[PDB]
Amino acid sequence: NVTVTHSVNLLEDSHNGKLCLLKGIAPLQLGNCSVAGWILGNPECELLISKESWSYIVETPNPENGTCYPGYFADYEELREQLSSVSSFERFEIFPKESSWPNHTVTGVSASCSHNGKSSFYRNLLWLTGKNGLYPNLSKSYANNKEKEVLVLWGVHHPPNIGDQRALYHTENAYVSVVSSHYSRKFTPEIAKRPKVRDQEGRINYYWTLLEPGDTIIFEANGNLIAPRYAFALSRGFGSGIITSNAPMDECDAKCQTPQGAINSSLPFQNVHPVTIGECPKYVRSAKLRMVTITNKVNSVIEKMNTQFTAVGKEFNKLERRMENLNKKVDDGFLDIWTYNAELLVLLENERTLDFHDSNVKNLYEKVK
């Protein structure tokens, strides 16, 4: 607590507290929809259909409503990582509804995804159901030939009991086999009675794959299929991420954004939050740093080696506890090592310049006599 004449405080703890623009491009305001609900076209998320360009992704801490029909999204946590760096995709109708399926009913709806009081379904899938009591084999295909990745989503349906299965697909042992040139799988239904969630007993299992240029994917199934209706022609990029926050929006224009606000300064260090998106100061886990007044060049070396991180805590399932503690330990150590490195550097730096000023007058006093 030594008194100092002229001080420059490196750390900064000022944030606007409002969600602002990032150099002139608006983010994707998910609002009340989770990522799993935006992609599958939730009926109550129809305001994000046309937003095919964004800078970063926002999400409320407790997204109210995602998968309207209860189920288990397979490899959900990996899909977020792939979509965490997409620059801007393009939604195109991979299988047009009017002509792709001429022998199947395409007007199936469920009461658990109600929209304006009327039962509806997703906007990117299509619950196929037999027509005239028949469910002929379906065999589609898609050859991607424009040097752009394609993200495909489909689903499999597990009815509640045997009575409902024979009344929809007119079979007992159904199967779904999705085959590509470097990906092969085969699914089967599981007819079991489960408790009530969202006033429903049956379940729907979702899946996804990421195609490649010049590749082909073949769909085959004689039952329990939720065929795709839309795909996504991705275009990867760098400098984007997923955050969880609740701050309101504004018409500002900043350079970096944090889950609690945006930074409008140029000091090397900040302490608002470890996570950040865009070019902005580094992070130090203390509350008082100051270099008494070279120093500007010194802080650059700390910054230069520190400029390798994203720190976005990757979400992990409930069966991957060893994932989380290993990942939590890695992030905890890195920030604590770096905060101690930056703390002592100033403590070592000031002691040298204080004697530099003392020897400066003593140098003149040496030449005085």
Epitope: E90, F92, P96, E98, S99, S141, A143, N145, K148, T216
Partner: antibody, heavy 122, light 103 residues
Framework: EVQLVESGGGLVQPKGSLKLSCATS????????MHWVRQAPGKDLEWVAR??????????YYAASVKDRITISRDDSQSMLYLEMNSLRSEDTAMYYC??????????????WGQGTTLTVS | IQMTQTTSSLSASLGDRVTISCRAS??????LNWYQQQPDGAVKLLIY???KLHSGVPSRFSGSGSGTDYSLTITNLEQEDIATYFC?????????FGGGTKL
């Protein structure tokens, strides 16, 4: 809306360079690859040559049989197109069409066409 | 590869259901568009992919089929829609058109 005006055609002896030009208006020239399409009298439509935008460094793909005799360039600032033919033959009496590509992921469809000039040989 | 077409001629009454088929030679994964060329004038685009529609095209134009067997169904014909129609692949580099039929 979208207008394609083509000019620069006329009779020529079968040894001299002939140049055609197609005009554009009503859209952005920078983000629309354009192709040249030739239709002979009494014969079916044919493809000639295609030029891509600045994304692929102005790639210039060509047809098979009609190679080594054309150079396609795009005057983006003037919003025009330039088709050049040297060493013609007796099979090049036809009308030549200006075609725009169209940007969507449903393959290639050539969403717009032009009026079309004429070109004869002797 | 080489794109074929149906019969080269057809006579259509008014109000009838008239179609034209454009069967290819090699499997084109649903990339077959349709055009229309009015006599002494321009040529338009009618349908892309397989069954989509273009802006300003009347709702009487639609198609169907997949693999190597397509159609361009026409219903409630009028006195304006009379021209020659061509089909064009969209798969590989030599985008070959069709021979076209007459109305």
């Amino acid at each position: 809306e979208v207008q394609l005006v083509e000019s620069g055609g006329g009779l020529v002896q079968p040894k001299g360079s002939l140049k055609l030009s197609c005009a554009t208006s009503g859209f952005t020239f920078n983000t629309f690859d354009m192709h040249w399409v030739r239709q002979a009298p009494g014969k079916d439509l044919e493809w000639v040559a295609r030029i891509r935008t600045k994304g692929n460094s102005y790639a210039t793909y060509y047809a098979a049989s009609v190679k080594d005799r054309i150079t396609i360039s795009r005057d983006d600032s003037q919003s025009m197109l330039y088709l050049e033919m040297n060493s013609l033959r007796s099979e090049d009496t036809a009308m030549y069409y200006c075609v725009r590509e169209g940007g969507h992921y449903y393959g290639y469809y050539f969403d717009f066409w032009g009026q079309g000039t004429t070109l004869t040989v002797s | 590869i080489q794109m074929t077409q149906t019969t080269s001629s057809l006579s259509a009454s008014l109000g009838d259901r008239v179609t034209i088929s454009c069967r290819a030679s090699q499997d084109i994964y649903n990339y077959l568009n349709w055009y229309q060329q009015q006599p002494d004038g321009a040529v338009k685009l009618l349908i892309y992919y397989t069954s989509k529609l273009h802006s300003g095209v009347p709702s009487r134009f639609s198609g169907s089929g997949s693999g190597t067997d397509y159609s361009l169904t026409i219903t409630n014909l009028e006195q304006e829609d009379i021209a020659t129609y061509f089909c064009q692949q969209g798969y590989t580099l030599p985008y070959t058109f069709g021979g076209g039929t007459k109305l």
